[model samples]
Target: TGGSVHSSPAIGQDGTIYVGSNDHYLYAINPNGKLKWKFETGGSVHSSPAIGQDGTIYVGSNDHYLYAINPNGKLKWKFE
Candidate 1:
């Protein structure tokens, strides 16, 4: 918990829950509330995380960057 959680969490089919926080990171939490991993964004993450059908995680950040993370919590791509 860094800044503020303003959005709901997105869960993947494999039970990975993705959430965005004001801390500028997108977190992937397991069903047991355990942190699976995290991806850093350019700025505060005030929006919700969207999980794609292909297991892609999308999140927006205040730092003017749109990030896309893979199922393993790795950076797949990004847009600024």
Candidate 2:
């Protein structure tokens, strides 16, 4: 939460705001602009997240990897 946000934000139907930052993390912000949760990657998250119809979040990081995260902030899978 202390790093810079280099990516734009994506919002879920449930009003969760998802964004990536230079702190090597993907964050879920509440509708009130508070931190809901965060998922850490191996490197800075430099790209925006895309949400699927099924609600999975797909994002890329500086580590040259793609991650799929669930609605509950859990990792679905990662592509390297």
Candidate 3:
């Protein structure tokens, strides 16, 4: 919690909250505060994530790339 949390969280159908931070990572946490996983970005992630109908997550970072991550916290693709 020391690092700045710059990104807004998006909730999934299963009640998972996905958030990004200035620490250059995206975090997936449960409603009970248990961490599900973390995916590293190249730079600070200040933009909010957008959830797709198919359950894909889209987020942006100061690294100049926009990423698409699967529900399981794996990178699906990236746009530079």
Clashes of each: 0, 0, 0
Top of the candidates by lDDT: 2
What lDDT does model 3 reach?
0.91
Task: Give the residue spans of candidate 2 off by over 4 A.
Answer: none
| lDDT string, candidate 1, 1-80, tens digits | 88788768987897888889888889998999899998888788887889888888988889888888988888998888
What's the lDDT for residue 16 in model 1? 82
- Pick by TM-score: which candidate is best? 2
- Give the Å shift of residue 27 in candidate 2: 0.2
User: How far off is residue 70 in model 2, in Å?
Assistant: 0.4
* lDDT at 79, model 2: 96
lDDT of 2 at 58: 96
- Taken over the whole model, the C-alpha lDDT of each candidate is 0.86, 0.94, 0.91
Order the candidate numbers by TM-score, best to worst. 2, 3, 1
* Global local distance difference test of model 1: 0.86
lDDT of 3 at 44: 91
- For model 2, residues 1-80, the per-residue Cα lDDT tens digits are 76999989999999999999999999999999888889999899989999999999999999999999998899999999
The TM-scores of all predictions, comma-separated, are: 0.92, 0.95, 0.95
What candidate 3 gets wrong by more than 4 Å, as runs, is none
TM-score of candidate 3 to 2 decimals: 0.95
